[PDB]
């Protein structure tokens, strides 16, 4: 069931009931990337 995803990375935790749909091409210190370059990632992930 590869439809729906979660995330598992953010620089910081969540203040309560604060929602973002912002899929960020993540890097460990900012760094606007086209992933999957080294230290250039996505946070979204399916379920299994």
């Amino acid at each position: 069931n590869y439809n729906y995803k979660y995330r598992y990375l953010r620089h910081g935790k969540l203040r309560p009931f604060e929602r973002d749909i912002s899929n960020v091409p993540f890097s460990p210190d900012g760094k606007p990337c086209t992933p999957p370059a080294l230290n250039c990632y996505w946070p979204l992930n399916d379920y299994g």
Partner: protein, 268 residues
């Protein structure tokens, strides 16, 4: 269409006293003839205020940070500078909320909303035509829209008093923007009047987004232009106030704790 203007004038970062303003009703609960403490995100007394004095050279709209809610005010002449842009990265990959008007009523909307680099309400100088209120541009992976009810909502340019001293406290709490309102009759030369204005709990919002970065929206008089108006911005901080309620049941005075040993003893 990232339409952008040019005549950018940035002032001396004009400073003002946060004289006695920022008090509102902390809950939805009446009391009478009493002295009630609370500790809540309030405007600190008597403190620094970044004024915004805008003229036909001075287009006051850079990026400003939220810092957990702002005290806001505007001294206007039929209420020119409607529109708040509240988001995180201020672009197409930012799920932001926007507070604008259809010149009759309030429309608020939250989604992925790309900004122009300097968009503009192309409002005419004798007419008031909101020509370019396009700004609800793109819509994918969206969240929210809301419509309140209509009232007297004017746009254009005047002369005389600063009759529209409107004061808007925008306070973040559990995804809940608390939006207050309050009215006061003034005409200052160009600064903050000395006095208080009790604010009232008009709006709460159920939204829940990472509100960090924001702008106001002006009106380009028609190329941009403005009249002799000014808007005020200050930051909020979680300190402790004593209010005072009359037997009429209205806030008449308040004293912060973290201001003055005089003030702290007053709330002690």
């Amino acid at each position: 269409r990232c339409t952008t203007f040019d005549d950018v004038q940035a002032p001396n970062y004009t400073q003002h006293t946060s004289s006695m303003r920022g008090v509102y009703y902390p809950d939805e609960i009446f009391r009478s003839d009493t002295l009630y403490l609370t500790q809540d995100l309030f405007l600190p007394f008597y403190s620094n205020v970044t004024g915004f004095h805008t003229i036909n050279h001075t287009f006051g709209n850079p990026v400003i940070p939220f810092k957990d809610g702002i005290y806001f005010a505007a001294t206007e002449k039929s209420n020119v500078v409607r529109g708040w842009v509240f988001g995180s990265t201020m672009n197409n990959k930012s799920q932001s909320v926007i507070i604008i008007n259809n010149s009759t009523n309030v429309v608020i909307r939250a989604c992925n909303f790309e900004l122009c680099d300097n968009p503009f309400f192309a409002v005419s100088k004798p007419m008031g035509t909101q020509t370019h209120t396009m700004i609800f541009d793109n819509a994918f992976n969206c969240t929210f829209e809301y419509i309140s009810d209509a009232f007297s909502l004017d746009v254009s340019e005047k002369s005389g008093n600063f009759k529209h001293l409107r004061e808007f406290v925008f306070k973040n709490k559990d995804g809940f923007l608390y939006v207050y309102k309050g009215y006061q009759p003034i005409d200052v030369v160009r600064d903050l009047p000395s006095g208080f204005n009790t604010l009232k709990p008009i709006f709460k919002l159920p939204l829940g987004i990472n509100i960090t970065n924001f702008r106001a929206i002006l009106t380009a008089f028609s190329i941009w232009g403005t009249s002799a108006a000014a808007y005020f911005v200050g930051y909020l901080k979680p300190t402790t106030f004593m209010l005072k309620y009359d037997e009429n049941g209205t806030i008449t005075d308040a004293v912060d704790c973290s201001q003055n040993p005089l003030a702290e003893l007053k709330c002690s």
